Design a protein around this ligand. Structure first.
Ligand SMILES: OC[C@H]1O[C@@H](O[C@H]2[C@H](O)[C@@H](O)[C@H](O)O[C@@H]2CO)[C@H](O)[C@@H](O)[C@H]1O
Ligand SMILES: OC[C@H]1O[C@@H](O[C@H]2[C@H](O)[C@@H](O)[C@H](O)O[C@@H]2CO)[C@H](O)[C@@H](O)[C@H]1O
Length: 289
């Protein structure tokens, strides 16, 4: 989505910019580009290239070229052995002079998918294998504020985020990831933003094989409850954890099977507006419904 999903982000590169992509463009990979088009813009381009050689000019797997004229458009093409391929023009350009934009390039198995300002713009079939793309170039009249990446790898820690919709009965938070091969423990916290206290602290401890959960209220930890019919976590084990909010307590499940219930100690459910995750895991995805 916004920032907890990026593993790498660069601000204000000078144009022309030619930089190495920090990881492979694997399917599901997201490249987010934010900037604005100057008032005198005639054209600019985002090129995903194999290398950065200028002689011979490095192959351009995917040339994204917004052009500004009476019938604004985006010209896409591929360059092989210094020669251009079949030109693909998308008209009704989303881009406009003196306006800012957000470009989201999603890497797919067989093509690139591109959305601008949250609206689908075009698809581009792979002409060069994306494994071969290792550098991103930006040229022309365009100002880039930031570029960011979200590889299919894991997310970076710590993970801190506000939850779009307030916490309340029926509200769900699902977390997916993998416990590190040599994990000790990790935690998943639901906090009251301002208060800065913790409504629900889920802390699985692998070294002690126990699931500690507690509440942090009034600048202090409460009475811990570890009772459980079966430790759901194992070092190196993939998992999905669903935290369901009910009227009387939280219901927590792991890999499709219920683990435990935690009666509410922080009664103002609607005030629980922050999710925090940390510890010995590879966080793969966080979803609050
Ligand atoms: O095809 C991408 C490539 O287009 C070049 O311009 C084209 C132009 O669109 C067309 O009208 C003309 O007949 O041929 C030119 C060369 O193929 C751009 O110069 C180049 O930078 C890419 O944008
Ligand atoms: O209540 C959860 C809270 O536990 C803290 O650790 C405790 C530990 O559980 C207890 O056995 C020991 O005697 O004292 C420790 C004091 O911290 C964690 O440090 C904290 O992060 C929470 O997980």
């Amino acid at each position: 989505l916004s920032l907890n999903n990026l593993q790498n982000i660069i601000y204000n590169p000078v144009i022309p910019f030619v930089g190495t992509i920090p990881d492979q463009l694997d399917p599901g990979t997201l490249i987010v580009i934010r900037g604005h088009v100057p008032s005198d813009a005639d054209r600019f381009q985002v090129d995903l290239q194999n290398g950065s050689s200028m002689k011979p000019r490095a192959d351009v797997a995917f040339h994204f070229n917004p052009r500004f004229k009476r019938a604004g458009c985006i010209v896409c093409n591929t360059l092989i052995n210094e020669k251009w391929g079949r030109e693909e023009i998308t008209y009704d350009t989303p881009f406009k002079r003196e306006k800012s934009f957000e470009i989201v390039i999603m890497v797919l198995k067989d093509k690139f998918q591109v959305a601008v300002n949250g609206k689908h713009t075009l698809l581009y079939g792979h002409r060069i294998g994306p494994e071969k793309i290792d550098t991103l170039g930006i040229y022309g009249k365009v100002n880039i504020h930031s570029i960011g990446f979200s590889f299919s790898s894991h997310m970076r820690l710590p993970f801190a985020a506000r939850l779009n919709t307030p916490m309340g009965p029926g509200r769900t938070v699902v977390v997916k990831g993998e416990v590190n091969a040599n994990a000790k423990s990790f935690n998943v916290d639901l906090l009251a933003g301002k208060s800065k206290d913790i409504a629900l602290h889920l802390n699985p401890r692998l070294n002690i094989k126990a699931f500690v959960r507690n509440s942090f209220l009034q600048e202090s930890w409460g009475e811990e409850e570890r009772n459980i019919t079966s430790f759901p976590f194992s070092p190196g084990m993939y998992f999905e954890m669903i935290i369901y909010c009910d009227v009387r307590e939280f219901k927590v499940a792991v890999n499709g099977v219920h683990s435990l219930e935690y009666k509410h100690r922080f009664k103002e459910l609607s005030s629980i507006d922050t999710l925090e995750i940390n510890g010995d895991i590879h966080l793969l995805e966080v979803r609050s419904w």
